[PDB]
Amino acid sequence: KNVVIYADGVYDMLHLGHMKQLEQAKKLFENTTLIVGVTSDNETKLFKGQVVQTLEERTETLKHIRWVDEIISPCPWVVTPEFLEKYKIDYVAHDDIYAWLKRAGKFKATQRTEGVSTTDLIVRILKNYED
Template sequence: MASVSNIRNFIHRAIHEPDSARQYRINPPPEGGKNPARPVRIYADGVYDLFHYAHALQLRQAKLSFPCVHLIVGVVSSELCAAHKNAPVMTSQERYAAVRNCRWVDEVIEDAPWVINQEILDKLSIDYVAHDDLPYAGAGTSAEMSDIYSFCKDQGRFLPTQRTEGVSTSELLARIVEQYRNHNYDQKLAKIGHEELAFH
């Protein structure tokens, strides 16, 4: 887990020492970023299905990017996720609660939009949108966007975070399916009264 100084050094370099591999600029933080009266307002968004430590570490990076941060997390609804990606395992309310109970989160926006727009930036007074900086394609969007965060990058409001390797919701789902196919859940399913779900 990265130290606070490592997180802030990474952000400082990203803002003040542009990398040729990064095709966007990042605005300097507002002057009040060191003053609790004017925290830096950072927005992160996602599905947060099967909420796990990589999710928490990404939110930790966002929260600790500057000395004083108000972290807002947008969580998309199950209906919206199913329309653009695939249906999550956890319900909308379960995912809202999981994120709300993460220690780094100050505020949760339920039923967040799939793609951030000017309206939400203005409404929430967002200084930065935090996400890892690999292009995130907008599958299912009207324009089939190559990167749904390009809007924020163009405004200098995108704040890169570093991915945690070795765990993801997709990886966890693959592990669950493997365990299921190996009959490792048969006894559990029988115990909770769902013998009919055992793998055959």
Template sequence: MNINDISSSLTGEWKSRTLTELYKADTKEVVRVYADGVYDLFHPGHVEQFRQVKAAFPNVYLIIGVCSDADTLKYKGCLPVMNEGECLKMVDQCRYVDEAYFSPPFFPTMEFINYLKADLVAHDSLPYNSPTTDDCYAIFKASDRFLETQRTPTISTTSLLSRIINDLDRYKARQLLRENSSPL
């Protein structure tokens, strides 16, 4: 979908609400929140982010954008361990997720968020570099449409990969033992 399609789909009475408006209103209405990521090696840290978003308001509709392998390779320089289909399936099966969206813009835009009719974008507060800015979430922070989530300090995709790399010989030996003891 291109930007023209997104802009033309913004019809109807929908109007985004800011974080401040939502907190002041103490609303029971549905709050639509978007979060994005690669979600490689889907783990408890991902689930915790989703849980935090769902707990932010009484009635949250959580939309998760799962980045494509091509975009992940282009912007992160490597392919994920789990392919995009596997990541999407894991995210979609999480009880906190109301909708899983495949291949969103790798760096979210206000046009895309409005197309989804999402009030807020959720992510941790660390700046996330893009080709055009030091923080691709800055526009959402500046417009009060950013819901900060806290990273889970004990687990991340990076830490899982480090565990595997640091103990690679043991995992290789375990795998060889399993392969050699499997019945034909």
């Protein structure tokens, strides 16, 4: 009855938005193991262009999140069928190169969620000191 869910991401500067998305992934079924993949520094820089927190920092922060059952750190940039087999993953939780997951019935959407980001915080603070 236990279902293994995989969610990967950069998880840079984690905020409530990320936490809620992890919660949603964890609750896709009644009994789950939520495995979270955390992307490497070098691949995040190459493919997204930048990253603020190191792999160690981003992983150590996720360890404190209630919904996270297991972490793969670093994770592969691109999910493969062999990877799903190796970790007995039943579903991939995502926000096409993803058509193969949908054809296999392994694709689960999570909807992005609002959070108070670092940027939101700075803007809120600075609003008290200048227009």
